[PDB]
Design a protein around this motif. Structure first.
Motif, short mmCIF file in Angstrom:
data_model
loop_
_atom_site.label_atom_id
_atom_site.label_comp_id
_atom_site.label_asym_id
_atom_site.label_seq_id
_atom_site.Cartn_x
_atom_site.Cartn_y
_atom_site.Cartn_z
N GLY E 10 0.81 -1.23 0.00
CA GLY E 10 0.00 0.00 0.00
C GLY E 10 0.84 1.27 0.00
O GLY E 10 2.08 1.20 -0.07
N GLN E 11 0.19 2.42 0.17
CA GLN E 11 0.83 3.71 -0.04
C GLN E 11 1.84 3.95 1.06
O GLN E 11 3.01 4.18 0.79
CB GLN E 11 -0.21 4.84 -0.06
CG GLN E 11 0.39 6.24 -0.20
CD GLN E 11 -0.63 7.27 -0.67
OE1 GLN E 11 -1.83 7.13 -0.43
NE2 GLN E 11 -0.14 8.32 -1.33
N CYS E 12 1.37 3.85 2.30
CA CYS E 12 2.20 4.08 3.47
C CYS E 12 3.35 3.09 3.53
O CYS E 12 4.52 3.47 3.73
CB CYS E 12 1.35 3.95 4.73
SG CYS E 12 2.25 4.04 6.29
N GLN E 15 5.93 4.03 0.86
CA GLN E 15 6.63 5.29 1.13
C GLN E 15 7.63 5.17 2.27
O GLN E 15 8.76 5.65 2.14
CB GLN E 15 5.65 6.44 1.34
CG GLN E 15 4.98 6.88 0.05
CD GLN E 15 3.90 7.93 0.25
OE1 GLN E 15 3.27 8.02 1.31
NE2 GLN E 15 3.65 8.73 -0.80
N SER E 138 0.09 0.08 6.73
CA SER E 138 -0.82 0.65 7.71
C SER E 138 -1.91 -0.37 7.97
O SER E 138 -2.09 -1.29 7.19
CB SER E 138 -1.46 1.94 7.17
OG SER E 138 -0.50 2.97 7.02
N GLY E 142 -6.96 -0.05 2.89
CA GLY E 142 -7.41 -1.33 2.34
C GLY E 142 -6.31 -2.28 1.87
O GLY E 142 -6.43 -3.49 2.05
N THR E 143 -5.26 -1.75 1.24
CA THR E 143 -4.20 -2.55 0.65
C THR E 143 -3.27 -3.08 1.74
O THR E 143 -3.22 -4.30 2.02
CB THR E 143 -3.39 -1.71 -0.38
OG1 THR E 143 -4.28 -1.23 -1.40
CG2 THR E 143 -2.27 -2.53 -1.02
N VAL E 169 1.67 1.05 10.81
CA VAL E 169 1.24 2.42 11.13
C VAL E 169 -0.24 2.43 11.57
O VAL E 169 -1.13 2.13 10.77
CB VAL E 169 1.49 3.37 9.95
CG1 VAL E 169 1.06 4.80 10.29
CG2 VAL E 169 2.97 3.34 9.58
N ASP E 177 -7.69 9.57 9.87
CA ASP E 177 -7.33 9.83 8.48
C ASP E 177 -8.22 9.01 7.53
O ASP E 177 -7.97 8.97 6.32
CB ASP E 177 -5.85 9.49 8.27
CG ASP E 177 -5.19 10.35 7.19
OD1 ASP E 177 -5.89 10.87 6.28
OD2 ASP E 177 -3.95 10.51 7.25
N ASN E 204 1.27 8.26 13.81
CA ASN E 204 1.66 9.54 13.23
C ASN E 204 1.51 10.69 14.20
O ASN E 204 2.29 11.63 14.12
CB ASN E 204 0.87 9.83 11.95
CG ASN E 204 1.41 9.07 10.75
OD1 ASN E 204 2.59 9.17 10.43
ND2 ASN E 204 0.54 8.32 10.09
N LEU E 207 4.63 10.88 16.13
CA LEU E 207 5.70 11.30 15.24
C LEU E 207 5.71 12.80 15.05
O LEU E 207 6.77 13.43 15.16
CB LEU E 207 5.61 10.58 13.88
CG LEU E 207 6.38 9.27 13.71
CD1 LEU E 207 6.33 8.36 14.93
CD2 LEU E 207 5.85 8.54 12.49
N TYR E 222 6.01 14.45 5.54
CA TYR E 222 5.87 13.01 5.72
C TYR E 222 7.21 12.31 5.58
O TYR E 222 7.43 11.33 6.28
CB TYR E 222 4.83 12.39 4.78
CG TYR E 222 3.45 12.10 5.38
CD1 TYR E 222 3.27 11.85 6.74
CD2 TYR E 222 2.34 12.01 4.55
CE1 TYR E 222 2.01 11.56 7.26
CE2 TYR E 222 1.08 11.73 5.05
CZ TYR E 222 0.92 11.50 6.41
OH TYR E 222 -0.33 11.22 6.91
N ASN E 226 8.91 9.59 8.08
CA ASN E 226 9.38 8.33 7.53
C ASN E 226 10.80 8.05 7.95
O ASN E 226 11.13 6.91 8.24
CB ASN E 226 9.30 8.34 5.99
CG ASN E 226 7.89 8.21 5.47
OD1 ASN E 226 7.35 9.12 4.84
ND2 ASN E 226 7.28 7.06 5.69
N1 LIG Z 1 4.05 7.70 8.63
C1 LIG Z 1 3.42 7.73 7.42
N2 LIG Z 1 2.09 7.47 7.37
C2 LIG Z 1 1.42 7.49 6.19
C3 LIG Z 1 2.16 7.80 4.97
N3 LIG Z 1 1.28 7.76 3.96
C4 LIG Z 1 0.07 7.43 4.48
N4 LIG Z 1 0.15 7.29 5.81
C5 LIG Z 1 -0.95 6.91 6.71
O1 LIG Z 1 -1.61 5.71 6.28
C6 LIG Z 1 -3.03 5.85 6.44
C7 LIG Z 1 -3.70 5.75 5.08
O2 LIG Z 1 -3.50 4.42 4.59
P1 LIG Z 1 -2.85 4.01 3.18
O3 LIG Z 1 -1.67 3.12 3.49
O4 LIG Z 1 -2.64 5.26 2.36
O5 LIG Z 1 -4.05 3.18 2.49
P2 LIG Z 1 -3.84 1.85 1.61
O6 LIG Z 1 -2.95 2.33 0.48
O7 LIG Z 1 -5.25 1.51 1.15
O8 LIG Z 1 -3.25 0.82 2.54
C8 LIG Z 1 -3.27 7.20 7.09
O9 LIG Z 1 -3.41 7.03 8.51
C9 LIG Z 1 -2.02 7.99 6.77
O10 LIG Z 1 -1.76 8.96 7.79
C10 LIG Z 1 3.61 8.09 5.11
O11 LIG Z 1 4.31 8.37 4.12
N5 LIG Z 1 4.15 8.04 6.33
#
Ligand SMILES: Nc1nc2c(ncn2[C@@H]2O[C@H](COP(=O)(O)OP(=O)(O)O)[C@@H](O)[C@H]2O)c(=O)[nH]1
Ligand SMILES: Nc1nc2c(ncn2[C@@H]2O[C@H](COP(=O)(O)OP(=O)(O)OP(=O)(O)O)[C@@H](O)[C@H]2O)c(=O)[nH]1
Ligand SMILES: Nc1nc2c(ncn2[C@@H]2O[C@H](COP(=O)(O)OP(=O)(O)OP(=O)(O)O)[C@@H](O)[C@H]2O)c(=O)[nH]1
Ligand SMILES: Nc1nc2c(ncn2[C@@H]2O[C@H](COP(=O)(O)OP(=O)(O)O)[C@@H](O)[C@H]2O)c(=O)[nH]1
Ligand SMILES: [Mg+2]
Ligand SMILES: [Mg+2]
Lengths: 131, 432, 429, 432, 429
Positions: E10-12, E15, E138, E142-143, E169, E177, E204, E207, E222, E226
């Protein structure tokens, strides 16, 4: 039906910390030792119930709150009650929930004036309200 | 950090405000466009670009006076939303100001204030400029003060008020407006600094050698006093005083919150030379009744508090010496319940002079804020004026027509009677 | 060993403190950056008494700066030596106290106090063997007075076996610098009597006189006043920081000077003090120094020692000098001025000598007098308090903050009792 | 990759589409001829030559409005087959749109959609622009939605709808059209974003200082909101949201799928200077009822979900801080079954400004999508309007004449009654 | 030997992962191309723990990147260090999960999972002796949440004798969020309790606080958040990659920190953290570091350790330092803060020291706390879940994907049981 009050520049009409705490403890059957313990909002919610029968959903209030968010939740309930009664004083929630003395003392002095304006002398056993 | 927000109400308030903000700009090196080629920040908010905007609200119930601001030299200095105007004025009627006309714009004014305060990290409070005599200055200001007390409360609120003269009036209904506004505002204001047009005019003529002083001149003089009061916040100093302290030091009883302001030296270029102008010299000048900016006699009253704010090339020892000698002086009597009557501020920055101003550039100045039982005379006079007209119900129909009730006249009057008696009681010395 | 923690409260407290730190740094050869550029090993031997050693050969004052408003702090930061201080050791509020003891002690100060306590505790934990605390402040304001006293109360509770000393700038007799000063002083004093081990009373009236008459300074500045006070301050800890022949410290001085727990209010003095022109016409000998010390015009408290009796007097000498001579001089003053010394404490003069003199000087002296004459000061305050309290003048400023008349009353009574106690020992045979 | 296909129905839909595609071109540097001197690809398909064609269909039942597109500045931007017109309009009649006239062109429209979708590798879904009041916007759109649901289904479908005002109408039969289309489309749409002409007009006048806003201005404003929604797909960002997420985060119950859009800041060059425009400041602005783009009162409702989409020079910590304070605020109440009410997006690209536009260029913007029980007021109002006319069978003959049955009026009405009760039920707090 | 497989979901997850890989490459002297340009032989000795060696003197991360949408992946590819990764190790879908756990675990994720598993198996077969897996993601999306948990389940089934660890996370207390975050977290946690050996909880809110208060960063990004997390991550494997005096590894840490299988949720911390101006005024000594570690304000999970008790605490030091000193410091904290440590596990502090410090530093420390206070976090989630589930809010988004209420119910129950378990040991004597 409710009314609004203001306290800024006055003399011979303000309770000492001790006296005010005593009033709160006697009125609500509480055991506070610091005025800042009123920052949890449960006490204020209870006072609202005692003043205005009905008014607040006390089953939602957390009487043993320990965390900032819990305190916030109680103040949301209080805010709703203020809205329902048409009391137009803005409650400085962010300052109160930090448990700061100054702000809490200011709020209790206002709330006492508000209470006195509106209290009709009815009996109220707050223990039942609590549980 | 220590922000201070200025509110200018009605013609007097606005015009004094123009003079004040012109002076502030000169003092901080801010151009009429808001540009400067860090302390200013207490009075000016700052943008992303190199631009500075006054922490101010200008309000009037008619457009004419504010329109001058909008179209004038400092058009770019103020943000449009901080210049607030209605359509019709309060027509020298407190009722129109407080109720009929004022109730239409109060919400707007307060909204803007809220937004101003949101961008403060350490808001100290409010400076309110108005007059006692106008319908807006009296009625609107009273309304505003009520709302401010409710929404903020413990923030120190200070008023600068063009108090009406004994023998120099502008309107006929002045006494009514003065009395009602004083009654309604009394429990909501922490301290109110009176200034009188007659006195300032006299000073201009005698001390500045001006044949024909204009309102502009008076405004300029007022600005100086304001600067002295706020210099402790806008500059670094040896011994400092911050807005909350004034109330503590000058108000012995809640109702007795009317000190008076006096500035020294007020001199011209011809008379700025030919004399050394020491701290002792200016201090002595301040006390002497001829240099006072209210048409009242302190020799017939007693001092309850003096606050002395020195600025520029000043030495603390010298100030102490000067004060000591003034204490001895027979013509200065203090109330018996007040052995310590002086609060003293000393600031390093000399008074800055506006290009084309009537005052000469001096190394030192002083602004005295003094509370005296002598001011009760004025209150008595005002009461008498009210009595004469009210006995005949002269003009009363206007006020009633705008929704005021006649009983409220009586109420206000009795409150003022009480105030007068409070002063008298205070005057007397302690038994045993 | 014997590390001291320095605490500064309010405008006066901070401005004195800055001067003191400038002085001490100069003494130990520390520059505005915290680096040692001194000449001798003696300058570094006991550097740990006032400085923590940081990484990269820097020294940082064990100093905590407190104020309820940020202006003075900012000024200090921008001043010469401002950069030497630990950034985390500045604890500032945003509101101010408005010259109100109540605000400093119960309201604004109370919101800030815990944050200060946290720093203080950390500082204490740094030290291998904490000697105690020195607090600089006025009794006439709101911060230094109300918040300072609160700090004293809490620190003492935390560390009851360490020495608590204060350098208190007291209200003068001739002219007040604040309208409510009697209230603020009165409330402060009640705290001080119960919670400090020793209190040096310093009064600006005396200081100005000294500057004008003795130093021949037509136009003294507050800086010049501060410097005098700092010189006294440095003098009191000199034997802790430098080797000498007869070594004093804070505990010993307390023991010698305080015969009863409540009577711990001193009147400090410093010598030698001379003009630029007038110094070439005198000799800096021990007797001269002694004479300068033991007069009334050189006391920094606005009370004449000739109006009372000395209970105990401590003399601290800095420089290479003859012990015999010192003993002779001390004996002489006692013998010839017998009527000014209490008869039931024989040999009530305590002497200390530190071999390291102050900069620029061959010899210097610091005087600590515990005189029954200081009761005059307290009496004045009581009188002034009474005049105001009897009419309840300004009282709503304090009651508005939750305070009651009872507290005021008690404070008044306590102060009166202290005066009575002083009177009793003055008259005792 | 993440393709998104836009459908513009009737006059409103087409004209808003013109504004949207003009903005998109400026944002991606695409000229009016389709030429550019990689992210654009979600909205533009690309030829063998250096030319880019919108993933769009424009449909109207009459030729006039689309003819302007054909003959206008962006004639070369669109492929002829994506501009679809009939002969006769639906004459403010849902029946004509859904049945009589619509059944003649629906197949064509759908065929073109199929061809568009064939050239997508990762089609996310559809953005549908129309109005509730017109015969085409109501009747044709409902028909289209039915077909799309059948032929695709699980692809997320989003509607932007010019919802009619309380006291500012255009046609007489608006309530009928609104009610029927809402009834027929409800089970086929995933989320519908309401916007109100009255509200936007008010905003233009108050916030942008425009005496006389045109439909063009409103369209431009709408375009901004669209851009905010799709910027997460058209640009790179810190924290992202993709069309499928909105439905998840804003729709708590299947029927309750009507959030509302609010944009901040909307300011002019005169008012863009004189203020810093922080994240906290704009966030606060969003919530306040005066900046809302639907004529409804949230203070009288409860929030069920807020989605905040920030863009430009934005710092996540700051956003968090801003939101926290808004949470405390008494004027913002959230439903009891929703402790977590905020979904937050942050994108790096600042809002781009159309040359000759009414909005000033800002470093930051925010678009809030919020779902509130307050919107039920509007539904009630609409129902009332329906009731008044239907009791007399006013205009009903038209609808019946085009093949509608009278029973279907009643059916639609009862469905809307049910919807109203659903909102009310949701409103109440949980027992125990 | 002891090769680790890194997985990002996923995104988090991605990253954080990018940052982590940037850090590790810097540590081992690897540039954005995969070439070694370091100075010392120690940098290459254990390079195989995280890197596969490819032809022509290049190193490639043993890293697998997973997402159901391609935007984040693309960004990573275009980022600094994007070209170091194996192109075949990016496994991306086209649909997305729409913040829905169901989609990640059962639907879209399920369509992608086999493809990821295939890569994973290949990677495993590369390694001579696979230590196990580290997954970054995270629980709120969802991912990372749904698909990540699925991956955990499958990998664990395949490789039940290897260590499974996660850097999760977690949702914060103050502000969400995501609207459905309690659901996603709740479902995730049920999986984590059964399928991971250890889970580092990172929040977060904590952090941001650290960045603002400790690092003095007015405007953290961010990226800056990280970096902190990556520093912690690197700290946990430091003793596997560099020689030291007392060598830890992933297994040992687990053994020391997990007394009961379900109680494997940690609260990580890192030291030292200082501003640019404020670093010159402190000394980087072991005691200071220890103090920084053992406070509440420096924990990266939004729960106060003072609200519970520490079950077990692991401290990992990097740099040349005195073992005796470390032992003293660890003992001291236990002795003085006795009430915050469970009484039935004596000497519940585990210490490791690696001789190689991080870049720019003379010494650094990483803290792993297993505190009963983390139960607060779980309780909050349970509460939030309840409030929504009682009204079946948003439930059709999950049931629409084939999920039943029963699953939700079970998840809720399991979470409650975990909380109960924590409570039980908190109160046990
Ligand atoms: N520490 C940190 N938290 C993140 C980052 N990007 C997204 N998040 C957190 O991850 C959560 C969103 O989930 P995300 O991973 O984007 O969704 P998914 O891609 O569907 O798993 C939120 O609580 C955000 O604050 C990042 O670069 N660093
Ligand atoms: N010092 C000074 N006094 C002024 C000035 N302008 C007006 N005044 C005084 O203010 C009083 C008249 O009140 P205004 O402020 O004009 O009246 P207003 O507040 O506009 O109220 P309405 O016009 O009745 O709505 C008189 O005593 C004037 O002498 C000025 O520029 N300087
Ligand atoms: N915001 C906005 N609203 C528009 C615009 N054009 C029309 N409307 C609104 O759309 C509604 C009228 O519907 P239209 O789209 O004109 O009608 P239609 O879809 O062409 O349907 P028929 O003409 O009946 O076949 C009214 O509420 C108008 O205010 C526009 O450019 N912008
Ligand atoms: N010796 C000395 N006295 C000072 C200084 N600054 C203020 N004072 C005295 O302190 C008193 C004012 O109290 P202050 O400490 O400013 O108020 P606070 O900040 O509220 O505690 C007055 O009597 C001043 O004369 C200074 O720099 N040196
Ligand atoms: Mg007027
Ligand atoms: Mg049409």
């Amino acid at each position: 039906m409710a009314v609004n009050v203001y306290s800024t520049s006055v003399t011979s009409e303000n309770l000492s910390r001790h006296d005010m705490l005593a009033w709160v403890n006697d009125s609500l059957h509480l055991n506070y030792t610091k005025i800042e313990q009123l920052c949890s909002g449960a006490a204020y919610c209870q006072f609202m119930d005692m003043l205005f029968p009905g008014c607040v959903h006390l089953r939602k209030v957390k009487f043993q709150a320990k965390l900032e968010h819990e305190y916030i939740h109680n103040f949301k309930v209080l805010q709703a009650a203020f809205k329902k009664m048409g009391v137009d004083k803005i409650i400085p929630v962010e300052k109160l929930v930090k448990g700061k003395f100054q702000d809490n003392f200011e709020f209790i002095q206002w709330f006492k004036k508000f209470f006195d304006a509106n209290y009709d002398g009815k009996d109220y056993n707050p223990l039942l309200a609590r549980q | 950090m220590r922000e201070c927000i200025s509110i200018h109400v009605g013609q007097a308030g606005v015009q004094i405000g123009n003079a004040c903000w012109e002076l502030y700009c000169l003092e901080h090196g801010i151009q009429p466009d808001g540009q400067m080629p860090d302390s200013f920040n207490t009075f000016f908010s700052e943008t992303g670009a190199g631009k500075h905007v006054p922490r101010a609200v200008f309000v009037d119930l008619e457009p004419t006076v504010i329109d001058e601001v909008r179209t004038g030299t400092y058009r770019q200095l103020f943000h449009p939303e901080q210049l607030i105007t209605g359509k019709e004025d309060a027509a020298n009627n407190y009722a129109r100001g407080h109720y009929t006309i004022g109730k239409e714009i109060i919400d707007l004014v307060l909204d803007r204030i809220r937004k101003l305060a949101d961008q403060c990290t350490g808001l100290q409070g409010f400076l309110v400029f108005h007059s006692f005599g106008g319908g807006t200055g009296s009625g609107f200001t009273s309304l505003l003060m009520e709302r401010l007390s409710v929404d903020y409360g413990k923030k120190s609120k200070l008023e600068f008020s063009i108090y009406p003269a004994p023998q120099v009036s502008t309107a006929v209904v002045e006494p009514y407006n003065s009395i009602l506004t004083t009654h309604t505002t009394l429990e909501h204001s922490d301290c109110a600094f009176m200034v009188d047009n007659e006195a300032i005019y006299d000073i201009c003529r005698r001390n500045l050698d001006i044949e024909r002083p204009t309102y502009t001149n008076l405004n300029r003089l007022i600005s100086q006093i304001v600067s002295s009061i706020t210099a402790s916040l806008r500059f670094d100093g040896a011994l400092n005083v911050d807005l909350t302290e004034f109330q503590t030091n000058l108000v012995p009883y809640p109702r007795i919150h009317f000190p008076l302001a006096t500035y020294a030296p007020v001199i011209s270029a011809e008379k700025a030379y030919h004399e050394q102008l020491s701290v002792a010299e200016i201090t002595n000048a301040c006390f002497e009744p001829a240099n006072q900016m209210v048409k009242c006699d302190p020799r017939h009253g007693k001092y309850m508090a003096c606050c002395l704010l020195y600025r520029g090339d000043v030495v603390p020892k010298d100030v102490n010496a000067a004060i000591a000698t003034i204490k001895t002086k027979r013509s200065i009597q203090f109330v018996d319940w007040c052995p310590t009557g002086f609060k003293v501020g000393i600031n390093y920055q000399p008074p800055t002079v506006v290009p084309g101003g009537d005052l000469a550039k001096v190394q030192r100045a002083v602004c005295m804020l003094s509370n005296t039982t002598a001011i009760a005379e004025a209150w008595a006079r005002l009461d008498h004026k009210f009595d004469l007209m009210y006995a005949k119900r002269a003009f009363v129909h206007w006020y009633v027509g705008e929704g005021m009730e006649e009983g409220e006249f009586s109420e206000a009057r009795e409150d003022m009677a009480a105030l007068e008696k409070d002063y008298e009681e205070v005057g007397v010395d302690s038994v045993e | 060993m014997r590390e001291i923690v320095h605490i500064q409260a309010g405008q006066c407290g901070n401005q004195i403190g800055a001067k003191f730190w400038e002085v001490i740094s100069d003494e130990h050869g520390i520059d505005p950056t915290g680096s040692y550029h001194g000449d001798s090993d003696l300058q570094l031997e006991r550097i740990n008494v006032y400085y923590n050693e940081a990484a990269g050969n820097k020294y940082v004052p064990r100093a905590i700066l407190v104020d309820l408003e940020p202006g003075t702090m900012d000024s200090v930061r921008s001043g010469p030596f401002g950069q030497i201080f630990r950034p985390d050791n500045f604890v500032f509020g945003q509101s101010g106290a408005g010259n109100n003891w109540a605000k400093g002690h119960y309201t604004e100060g109370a919101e800030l106090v815990d944050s200060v306590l946290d720093v203080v505790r950390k500082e204490s934990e740094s030290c291998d063997c904490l000697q105690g605390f020195q607090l600089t402040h006025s009794l006439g304001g709101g911060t230094g007075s109300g918040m300072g006293t609160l700090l004293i109360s809490k620190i003492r509770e935390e560390y009851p076996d360490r020495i608590m000393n204060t350098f208190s700038v007291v209200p003068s007799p001739k002219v007040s610098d604040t309208v409510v000063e009697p209230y603020n002083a009165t409330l402060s004093v009640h705290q001080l009597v119960e919670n400090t081990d020793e209190t040096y009373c310093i009064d600006n009236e005396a200081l100005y006189d000294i500057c004008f008459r003795t130093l021949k300074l037509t136009t003294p500045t507050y800086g010049d006043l501060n410097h005098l006070v700092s010189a006294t301050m440095s003098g009191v800890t000199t034997c802790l920081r430098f080797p000498g022949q007869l070594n004093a410290d804070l505990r010993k001085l307390a023991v010698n000077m305080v015969p009863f727990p409540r009577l711990h209010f001193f009147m400090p003095g410093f010598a030698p003090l001379t003009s630029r022109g007038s110094q070439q016409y005198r000799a800096l000998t021990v007797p001269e120094l002694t004479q300068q010390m033991f007069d009334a015009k050189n006391m920094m408290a606005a009370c004449d020692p000739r109006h009372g009796r000395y209970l105990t007097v401590a003399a601290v000498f800095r420089g290479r000098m003859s012990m015999k001579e010192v003993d002779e001089q001390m004996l002489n003053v006692q013998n010839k001025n017998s009527s000014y010394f209490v008869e039931w404490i024989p040999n009530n003069v305590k002497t200390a000598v530190c071999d390291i003199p102050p900069r620029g000087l061959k010899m210097s002296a610091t005087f600590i007098g515990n005189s029954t004459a200081i009761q005059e000061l307290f009496k004045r305050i009581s009188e002034q308090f009474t005049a105001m309290f009897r009419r309840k003048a300004f009282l709503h400023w304090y009651t508005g903050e939750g305070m009651d008349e009872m507290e005021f009353t008690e404070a008044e009574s306590n102060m009166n009792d202290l005066v009575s106690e002083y009177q009793q020992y003055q008259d005792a045979t």
